[PDB]
């Protein structure tokens, strides 16, 4: 489809290192898809918690299938639909 919509995913985890691997890992898998991903964008740590935001441009259905095939490692969280 024409698309033209961007998707943002927020990652949360006590250890920034772990969250860094999840964001970088997803970026490599997302970039592999026709859709493009920007970031990861680092955010302010709160309550000793690190969070990152990755923007997605022209997202495709192959990106969602890859996310379902890969399961985020324990200690990481994601926000969908606000």
UniProtKB/Swiss-Prot annotation:
GO biological process, one term: translation
SMART domains reported for this sequence: Ribosomal_S10
Record PROSITE patterns: RIBOSOMAL_S10
Top-level lineage group: Bacteria
Transmembrane domains' residue ranges: none
Entry's Gene Ontology cellular component terms: ribonucleoprotein complex; ribosome
One Gene Ontology molecular-function label: tRNA binding
Keyword Metal-binding in record: no
Keywords of the record: Ribonucleoprotein, Ribosomal protein
InterPro entries recorded: Ribosomal_uS10, Ribosomal_uS10_CS, Ribosomal_uS10_dom, Ribosomal_uS10_dom_sf
Pfam families linked to this entry: Ribosomal_S10
Subunit and interaction comment: Part of the 30S ribosomal subunit.
NCBIfam families for this protein: PRK00596.1 (NF001861), rpsJ_bact (TIGR01049)
General function of this protein: Involved in the binding of tRNA to the ribosomes.
Family membership: Belongs to the universal ribosomal protein uS10 family.
Protein name: Small ribosomal subunit protein uS10
Organism: Thermotoga sp. (strain RQ2)
Chain's gene name: rpsJ
């Amino acid at each position: 489809s024409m698309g033209g919509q961007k998707i943002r995913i927020k990652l949360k985890a006590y250890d920034h290192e772990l969250l860094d691997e999840s964001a970088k890992k997803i970026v490599e898998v997302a970039k592999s898809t026709n859709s493009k991903v920007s970031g990861p964008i680092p955010l302010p740590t709160e309550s000793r918690v690190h969070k990152r935001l990755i923007d997605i441009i022209d997202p495709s259905p192959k990106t969602i299938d890859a996310l379902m095939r890969i399961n985020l490692p324990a200690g990481v969280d994601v926000e969908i639909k606000l």
